[PDB]
PDB file of C-alpha atoms in Angstrom:
ATOM      1  CA  UNK A   1       0.000   0.000   0.000  1.00 61.06           C
ATOM      2  CA  UNK A   2       2.808   2.399   0.998  1.00 66.46           C
ATOM      3  CA  UNK A   3       5.176   1.660  -1.928  1.00 68.66           C
ATOM      4  CA  UNK A   4       2.265   2.163  -4.385  1.00 71.41           C
ATOM      5  CA  UNK A   5       1.593   5.604  -2.891  1.00 71.25           C
ATOM      6  CA  UNK A   6       5.266   6.621  -3.021  1.00 70.88           C
ATOM      7  CA  UNK A   7       5.390   5.851  -6.762  1.00 71.61           C
ATOM      8  CA  UNK A   8       1.971   7.574  -7.022  1.00 74.19           C
ATOM      9  CA  UNK A   9       3.006  10.867  -5.335  1.00 73.85           C
ATOM     10  CA  UNK A  10       6.827  11.073  -4.965  1.00 77.31           C
ATOM     11  CA  UNK A  11       7.855  10.005  -8.501  1.00 75.85           C
ATOM     12  CA  UNK A  12       8.914  13.146 -10.326  1.00 74.14           C
ATOM     13  CA  UNK A  13      12.232  13.862  -8.603  1.00 71.17           C
ATOM     14  CA  UNK A  14      14.287  11.952 -11.272  1.00 69.16           C
ATOM     15  CA  UNK A  15      14.626  12.768 -15.052  1.00 67.44           C
ATOM     16  CA  UNK A  16      18.172  13.926 -14.250  1.00 67.85           C
ATOM     17  CA  UNK A  17      19.459  14.687 -10.679  1.00 65.46           C
ATOM     18  CA  UNK A  18      22.515  15.682  -8.520  1.00 63.91           C
ATOM     19  CA  UNK A  19      25.693  15.637 -10.796  1.00 63.51           C
ATOM     20  CA  UNK A  20      26.800  19.338 -10.591  1.00 61.63           C
ATOM     21  CA  UNK A  21      26.467  19.849  -6.781  1.00 59.85           C
ATOM     22  CA  UNK A  22      27.331  16.806  -4.580  1.00 62.49           C
ATOM     23  CA  UNK A  23      27.101  18.034  -0.901  1.00 62.72           C
ATOM     24  CA  UNK A  24      28.723  15.649   1.676  1.00 63.03           C
ATOM     25  CA  UNK A  25      29.248  16.791   5.297  1.00 61.46           C
ATOM     26  CA  UNK A  26      32.772  17.669   6.420  1.00 58.22           C
ATOM     27  CA  UNK A  27      33.707  16.591  10.031  1.00 57.94           C
ATOM     28  CA  UNK A  28      33.314  19.115  12.899  1.00 58.79           C
ATOM     29  CA  UNK A  29      36.274  19.864  15.187  1.00 60.17           C
ATOM     30  CA  UNK A  30      35.396  19.642  18.895  1.00 58.14           C
ATOM     31  CA  UNK A  31      37.147  22.127  21.183  1.00 55.98           C
ATOM     32  CA  UNK A  32      37.679  21.848  24.917  1.00 56.10           C
ATOM     33  CA  UNK A  33      36.343  25.250  25.854  1.00 57.40           C
ATOM     34  CA  UNK A  34      34.104  27.295  28.162  1.00 59.74           C
ATOM     35  CA  UNK A  35      31.225  29.716  27.672  1.00 59.56           C
ATOM     36  CA  UNK A  36      30.127  31.605  30.786  1.00 58.03           C
ATOM     37  CA  UNK A  37      27.106  33.905  30.591  1.00 56.00           C
ATOM     38  CA  UNK A  38      27.065  35.452  34.068  1.00 53.10           C
ATOM     39  CA  UNK A  39      23.566  36.632  34.991  1.00 51.63           C
ATOM     40  CA  UNK A  40      22.888  37.171  38.719  1.00 49.43           C
ATOM     41  CA  UNK A  41      19.295  38.278  38.015  1.00 49.10           C
ATOM     42  CA  UNK A  42      18.297  34.682  37.212  1.00 49.06           C
ATOM     43  CA  UNK A  43      17.194  32.575  40.257  1.00 52.49           C
ATOM     44  CA  UNK A  44      19.023  29.291  39.353  1.00 55.15           C
ATOM     45  CA  UNK A  45      22.234  28.426  37.464  1.00 55.69           C
ATOM     46  CA  UNK A  46      22.340  26.191  34.391  1.00 57.16           C
ATOM     47  CA  UNK A  47      25.414  24.117  33.540  1.00 56.06           C
ATOM     48  CA  UNK A  48      25.993  21.782  30.563  1.00 56.51           C
ATOM     49  CA  UNK A  49      29.293  19.861  30.559  1.00 57.95           C
ATOM     50  CA  UNK A  50      30.313  17.489  27.704  1.00 57.71           C
ATOM     51  CA  UNK A  51      33.240  15.619  26.142  1.00 57.02           C
ATOM     52  CA  UNK A  52      33.391  14.607  22.462  1.00 57.35           C
ATOM     53  CA  UNK A  53      31.228  11.566  21.712  1.00 57.47           C
ATOM     54  CA  UNK A  54      31.841   9.164  18.787  1.00 57.15           C
ATOM     55  CA  UNK A  55      28.680   9.634  16.657  1.00 60.00           C
ATOM     56  CA  UNK A  56      25.602   7.703  15.425  1.00 58.76           C
ATOM     57  CA  UNK A  57      27.327   4.647  13.850  1.00 59.93           C
ATOM     58  CA  UNK A  58      29.910   3.764  16.584  1.00 61.98           C
ATOM     59  CA  UNK A  59      29.185   0.413  18.393  1.00 67.50           C
ATOM     60  CA  UNK A  60      30.255   1.781  21.811  1.00 66.76           C
ATOM     61  CA  UNK A  61      27.319   4.251  22.023  1.00 65.95           C
ATOM     62  CA  UNK A  62      25.489   1.356  23.752  1.00 65.33           C
ATOM     63  CA  UNK A  63      28.143   1.099  26.533  1.00 67.49           C
ATOM     64  CA  UNK A  64      28.191   4.900  27.050  1.00 68.47           C
ATOM     65  CA  UNK A  65      24.409   4.898  27.391  1.00 70.19           C
ATOM     66  CA  UNK A  66      24.586   2.152  30.086  1.00 70.04           C
ATOM     67  CA  UNK A  67      26.999   4.324  32.127  1.00 73.37           C
ATOM     68  CA  UNK A  68      24.743   7.360  31.521  1.00 70.58           C
ATOM     69  CA  UNK A  69      21.897   5.255  32.921  1.00 72.39           C
ATOM     70  CA  UNK A  70      23.990   4.341  36.044  1.00 73.27           C
ATOM     71  CA  UNK A  71      24.458   8.087  36.682  1.00 70.81           C
ATOM     72  CA  UNK A  72      20.893   8.649  35.356  1.00 68.64           C
ATOM     73  CA  UNK A  73      18.802  11.765  35.971  1.00 69.64           C
ATOM     74  CA  UNK A  74      17.237  13.589  38.925  1.00 69.20           C
ATOM     75  CA  UNK A  75      14.456  16.019  39.643  1.00 68.45           C
ATOM     76  CA  UNK A  76      13.175  17.572  42.907  1.00 66.37           C
ATOM     77  CA  UNK A  77       9.714  15.933  42.321  1.00 69.18           C
ATOM     78  CA  UNK A  78      11.207  12.373  42.321  1.00 65.69           C
ATOM     79  CA  UNK A  79       9.919  10.256  45.159  1.00 66.31           C
ATOM     80  CA  UNK A  80      13.117   8.248  45.657  1.00 66.32           C
TER      81      UNK A  80
ATOM     82  CA  UNK B   1      35.749  81.649  29.690  1.00 69.13           C
ATOM     83  CA  UNK B   2      39.386  82.845  30.135  1.00 65.36           C
ATOM     84  CA  UNK B   3      42.763  82.237  28.347  1.00 64.62           C
ATOM     85  CA  UNK B   4      44.402  81.048  31.641  1.00 63.67           C
ATOM     86  CA  UNK B   5      41.206  79.130  32.663  1.00 65.00           C
ATOM     87  CA  UNK B   6      41.544  77.302  29.300  1.00 64.95           C
ATOM     88  CA  UNK B   7      45.133  76.567  30.457  1.00 65.09           C
ATOM     89  CA  UNK B   8      44.000  75.103  33.822  1.00 66.27           C
ATOM     90  CA  UNK B   9      41.605  72.990  31.690  1.00 68.24           C
ATOM     91  CA  UNK B  10      44.491  71.944  29.347  1.00 67.66           C
ATOM     92  CA  UNK B  11      46.754  71.071  32.351  1.00 66.84           C
ATOM     93  CA  UNK B  12      43.830  69.053  33.743  1.00 69.82           C
ATOM     94  CA  UNK B  13      43.490  67.275  30.373  1.00 66.74           C
ATOM     95  CA  UNK B  14      47.261  66.656  30.547  1.00 65.64           C
ATOM     96  CA  UNK B  15      47.026  65.096  34.049  1.00 63.85           C
ATOM     97  CA  UNK B  16      43.970  63.055  33.009  1.00 63.09           C
ATOM     98  CA  UNK B  17      46.013  61.605  30.129  1.00 63.90           C
ATOM     99  CA  UNK B  18      49.043  61.020  32.379  1.00 65.79           C
ATOM    100  CA  UNK B  19      46.883  59.208  35.000  1.00 64.61           C
ATOM    101  CA  UNK B  20      46.047  56.860  32.124  1.00 65.05           C
ATOM    102  CA  UNK B  21      42.967  55.020  33.462  1.00 65.63           C
ATOM    103  CA  UNK B  22      41.333  55.983  30.178  1.00 63.90           C
ATOM    104  CA  UNK B  23      43.913  53.727  28.488  1.00 68.17           C
ATOM    105  CA  UNK B  24      42.197  50.870  30.342  1.00 66.36           C
ATOM    106  CA  UNK B  25      38.740  52.173  29.246  1.00 72.93           C
ATOM    107  CA  UNK B  26      37.910  53.329  32.795  1.00 73.78           C
ATOM    108  CA  UNK B  27      35.980  56.390  33.836  1.00 73.62           C
ATOM    109  CA  UNK B  28      37.290  58.590  36.698  1.00 74.33           C
ATOM    110  CA  UNK B  29      34.569  57.409  39.133  1.00 74.22           C
ATOM    111  CA  UNK B  30      35.505  53.742  38.422  1.00 75.43           C
ATOM    112  CA  UNK B  31      38.890  54.417  39.960  1.00 77.75           C
ATOM    113  CA  UNK B  32      37.653  55.845  43.326  1.00 80.23           C
ATOM    114  CA  UNK B  33      38.731  54.142  46.595  1.00 78.23           C
ATOM    115  CA  UNK B  34      35.818  52.251  48.178  1.00 79.35           C
ATOM    116  CA  UNK B  35      35.000  53.767  51.578  1.00 77.99           C
ATOM    117  CA  UNK B  36      31.627  53.721  53.408  1.00 77.58           C
ATOM    118  CA  UNK B  37      30.186  56.823  51.604  1.00 78.23           C
ATOM    119  CA  UNK B  38      31.473  55.356  48.290  1.00 78.30           C
ATOM    120  CA  UNK B  39      30.053  51.823  48.971  1.00 76.43           C
ATOM    121  CA  UNK B  40      26.643  53.410  49.589  1.00 75.07           C
ATOM    122  CA  UNK B  41      26.835  55.531  46.422  1.00 78.28           C
ATOM    123  CA  UNK B  42      27.591  52.368  44.332  1.00 78.78           C
ATOM    124  CA  UNK B  43      24.662  50.692  46.178  1.00 80.01           C
ATOM    125  CA  UNK B  44      22.412  53.681  45.296  1.00 83.85           C
ATOM    126  CA  UNK B  45      23.241  53.551  41.522  1.00 85.34           C
ATOM    127  CA  UNK B  46      20.513  52.520  39.016  1.00 85.31           C
ATOM    128  CA  UNK B  47      20.721  49.128  37.265  1.00 87.70           C
ATOM    129  CA  UNK B  48      22.174  50.366  33.950  1.00 88.10           C
ATOM    130  CA  UNK B  49      24.992  52.393  35.581  1.00 86.15           C
ATOM    131  CA  UNK B  50      25.946  49.626  38.024  1.00 84.75           C
ATOM    132  CA  UNK B  51      26.072  47.078  35.188  1.00 85.42           C
ATOM    133  CA  UNK B  52      28.234  49.334  32.981  1.00 82.90           C
ATOM    134  CA  UNK B  53      30.481  50.115  36.000  1.00 85.32           C
ATOM    135  CA  UNK B  54      30.916  46.349  36.666  1.00 86.12           C
ATOM    136  CA  UNK B  55      31.886  45.748  33.014  1.00 86.57           C
ATOM    137  CA  UNK B  56      34.338  48.641  32.820  1.00 87.44           C
ATOM    138  CA  UNK B  57      36.059  47.416  36.052  1.00 87.93           C
ATOM    139  CA  UNK B  58      35.979  43.848  34.636  1.00 81.88           C
ATOM    140  CA  UNK B  59      37.583  44.960  31.343  1.00 83.15           C
ATOM    141  CA  UNK B  60      40.347  46.967  33.078  1.00 82.24           C
ATOM    142  CA  UNK B  61      41.272  44.156  35.491  1.00 82.72           C
ATOM    143  CA  UNK B  62      41.517  41.835  32.456  1.00 85.12           C
ATOM    144  CA  UNK B  63      43.817  44.299  30.654  1.00 83.53           C
ATOM    145  CA  UNK B  64      45.835  44.843  33.863  1.00 84.70           C
ATOM    146  CA  UNK B  65      46.383  41.065  34.137  1.00 84.35           C
ATOM    147  CA  UNK B  66      47.476  40.600  30.492  1.00 85.40           C
ATOM    148  CA  UNK B  67      49.545  43.878  30.866  1.00 85.85           C
ATOM    149  CA  UNK B  68      47.815  45.403  27.875  1.00 85.18           C
ATOM    150  CA  UNK B  69      46.029  48.692  27.183  1.00 84.77           C
ATOM    151  CA  UNK B  70      43.110  49.526  24.828  1.00 84.94           C
ATOM    152  CA  UNK B  71      43.578  50.789  21.202  1.00 86.92           C
ATOM    153  CA  UNK B  72      43.945  54.643  21.219  1.00 88.69           C
ATOM    154  CA  UNK B  73      40.418  55.291  19.811  1.00 87.27           C
ATOM    155  CA  UNK B  74      38.806  53.299  22.656  1.00 88.29           C
ATOM    156  CA  UNK B  75      40.352  55.462  25.450  1.00 85.97           C
ATOM    157  CA  UNK B  76      37.922  57.473  27.604  1.00 89.93           C
ATOM    158  CA  UNK B  77      38.054  61.026  26.327  1.00 87.39           C
ATOM    159  CA  UNK B  78      38.514  63.696  29.020  1.00 86.34           C
ATOM    160  CA  UNK B  79      35.628  65.745  27.508  1.00 89.10           C
ATOM    161  CA  UNK B  80      33.211  62.766  27.719  1.00 88.96           C
ATOM    162  CA  UNK B  81      34.238  61.348  31.133  1.00 89.30           C
ATOM    163  CA  UNK B  82      30.772  61.107  32.668  1.00 92.36           C
ATOM    164  CA  UNK B  83      30.987  61.693  36.425  1.00 91.41           C
ATOM    165  CA  UNK B  84      28.121  59.267  37.218  1.00 92.06           C
ATOM    166  CA  UNK B  85      28.884  58.851  40.968  1.00 88.80           C
ATOM    167  CA  UNK B  86      29.077  62.642  41.736  1.00 87.82           C
ATOM    168  CA  UNK B  87      25.414  63.450  42.729  1.00 92.15           C
ATOM    169  CA  UNK B  88      25.064  60.087  44.611  1.00 92.09           C
ATOM    170  CA  UNK B  89      28.305  60.516  46.599  1.00 93.21           C
ATOM    171  CA  UNK B  90      27.513  64.193  47.339  1.00 91.03           C
ATOM    172  CA  UNK B  91      24.107  63.134  48.743  1.00 87.50           C
ATOM    173  CA  UNK B  92      25.622  60.392  50.960  1.00 90.63           C
ATOM    174  CA  UNK B  93      28.172  62.848  52.455  1.00 91.99           C
ATOM    175  CA  UNK B  94      25.325  65.404  52.855  1.00 89.34           C
ATOM    176  CA  UNK B  95      23.368  62.826  54.868  1.00 88.75           C
ATOM    177  CA  UNK B  96      26.423  61.807  56.956  1.00 86.47           C
ATOM    178  CA  UNK B  97      27.244  65.438  57.791  1.00 87.03           C
ATOM    179  CA  UNK B  98      23.657  66.006  59.033  1.00 83.57           C
ATOM    180  CA  UNK B  99      23.819  62.900  61.280  1.00 83.25           C
ATOM    181  CA  UNK B 100      27.147  64.258  62.593  1.00 84.81           C
ATOM    182  CA  UNK B 101      25.663  67.741  63.232  1.00 84.38           C
ATOM    183  CA  UNK B 102      22.834  66.024  65.088  1.00 85.68           C
ATOM    184  CA  UNK B 103      25.244  63.844  67.133  1.00 88.85           C
ATOM    185  CA  UNK B 104      26.880  67.086  68.380  1.00 84.62           C
ATOM    186  CA  UNK B 105      24.083  68.880  70.266  1.00 83.59           C
TER     187      UNK B 105
ATOM    188  CA  UNK C   1      90.291  30.131  54.354  1.00 84.13           C
ATOM    189  CA  UNK C   2      87.957  28.448  51.834  1.00 84.48           C
ATOM    190  CA  UNK C   3      88.588  24.609  51.598  1.00 86.19           C
ATOM    191  CA  UNK C   4      85.092  24.186  50.058  1.00 84.77           C
ATOM    192  CA  UNK C   5      86.175  26.366  47.032  1.00 87.46           C
ATOM    193  CA  UNK C   6      86.426  23.521  44.456  1.00 86.16           C
ATOM    194  CA  UNK C   7      83.196  21.838  45.646  1.00 86.88           C
ATOM    195  CA  UNK C   8      81.106  25.054  45.596  1.00 89.25           C
ATOM    196  CA  UNK C   9      82.259  25.873  42.014  1.00 88.30           C
ATOM    197  CA  UNK C  10      81.284  22.296  41.040  1.00 87.47           C
ATOM    198  CA  UNK C  11      77.754  22.332  42.545  1.00 87.18           C
ATOM    199  CA  UNK C  12      77.461  25.960  41.325  1.00 84.54           C
ATOM    200  CA  UNK C  13      77.800  24.704  37.713  1.00 87.39           C
ATOM    201  CA  UNK C  14      75.198  22.033  38.517  1.00 87.48           C
ATOM    202  CA  UNK C  15      72.981  24.805  40.032  1.00 88.56           C
ATOM    203  CA  UNK C  16      73.249  26.920  36.838  1.00 87.60           C
ATOM    204  CA  UNK C  17      72.784  23.909  34.466  1.00 88.52           C
ATOM    205  CA  UNK C  18      69.722  22.732  36.464  1.00 87.29           C
ATOM    206  CA  UNK C  19      68.121  26.200  36.690  1.00 84.68           C
ATOM    207  CA  UNK C  20      68.714  26.632  32.954  1.00 82.97           C
ATOM    208  CA  UNK C  21      66.628  23.487  32.428  1.00 81.89           C
ATOM    209  CA  UNK C  22      64.082  24.161  35.252  1.00 80.24           C
ATOM    210  CA  UNK C  23      63.420  27.936  34.867  1.00 78.35           C
ATOM    211  CA  UNK C  24      61.938  27.727  31.279  1.00 79.05           C
ATOM    212  CA  UNK C  25      60.121  24.495  32.225  1.00 78.02           C
ATOM    213  CA  UNK C  26      58.302  25.881  35.327  1.00 77.10           C
ATOM    214  CA  UNK C  27      57.652  29.056  33.232  1.00 79.15           C
ATOM    215  CA  UNK C  28      55.990  26.874  30.531  1.00 80.69           C
ATOM    216  CA  UNK C  29      53.928  25.098  33.259  1.00 82.60           C
ATOM    217  CA  UNK C  30      52.694  28.485  34.611  1.00 82.49           C
ATOM    218  CA  UNK C  31      52.160  29.837  31.083  1.00 77.80           C
ATOM    219  CA  UNK C  32      50.086  26.671  30.234  1.00 77.83           C
ATOM    220  CA  UNK C  33      47.704  27.016  33.207  1.00 73.64           C
ATOM    221  CA  UNK C  34      47.482  30.811  32.735  1.00 70.94           C
ATOM    222  CA  UNK C  35      46.606  30.574  28.989  1.00 70.74           C
ATOM    223  CA  UNK C  36      42.959  29.941  30.103  1.00 73.12           C
ATOM    224  CA  UNK C  37      42.905  33.545  31.406  1.00 73.64           C
ATOM    225  CA  UNK C  38      45.364  35.117  28.854  1.00 73.39           C
ATOM    226  CA  UNK C  39      43.241  34.155  25.794  1.00 73.21           C
ATOM    227  CA  UNK C  40      39.830  34.592  27.541  1.00 71.77           C
ATOM    228  CA  UNK C  41      37.449  36.892  25.684  1.00 69.36           C
ATOM    229  CA  UNK C  42      34.855  39.240  27.201  1.00 72.59           C
ATOM    230  CA  UNK C  43      31.525  40.316  25.802  1.00 73.46           C
ATOM    231  CA  UNK C  44      29.058  42.637  27.523  1.00 71.08           C
ATOM    232  CA  UNK C  45      25.431  42.135  26.590  1.00 72.33           C
ATOM    233  CA  UNK C  46      23.085  44.522  28.564  1.00 70.13           C
ATOM    234  CA  UNK C  47      19.259  44.284  27.906  1.00 69.59           C
ATOM    235  CA  UNK C  48      17.567  46.223  25.035  1.00 74.04           C
TER     236      UNK C  48
END
């Protein structure tokens, strides 16, 4: 049903395509750095701290996620 | 108004330039020693002036540390050195002096 | 008057040769840690 509809409504993006402008993503350099927006008029401070992760495809995203689960998450409304 | 009163003003502009806080982007009132009357005057400043004051002090301490000075164009011009603390500090001393006149009788 | 003469000139060379290795090295250690402040950039963004 779905494949029929895709030929029914999405066909008409061929004829001739790409060729002249092939746009592949270049890698993005991670920098160990700090951004500090001091604002004492805001009631509570927000901090986000991160190292460079490996990316979508890497098999060891599973193992990192397990450790991230061990640390987990908290919230003042949690019963625990 | 006078030729010699323009000379006192030019000697004052000389000293101002020799003092060289303007080289660090500071205004004159930024550089004042913090006593009790002064602390209160800072306390009494509006939000916009306090925030600017904080940044100017921040900038100059940063320059002081890296032993640098601002580009010549960015120096505080003697003519436009806004004496923002003046009326606040004058009012605090006015109030102190009254208390002291009262504490005398 | 100075029996130690020869020995002090010897350790004195060792003092100079060590300091010549240590002075730039401790300098580079201090310069490394301080580069966080030396290259720090300020921006002031007051409301409207």
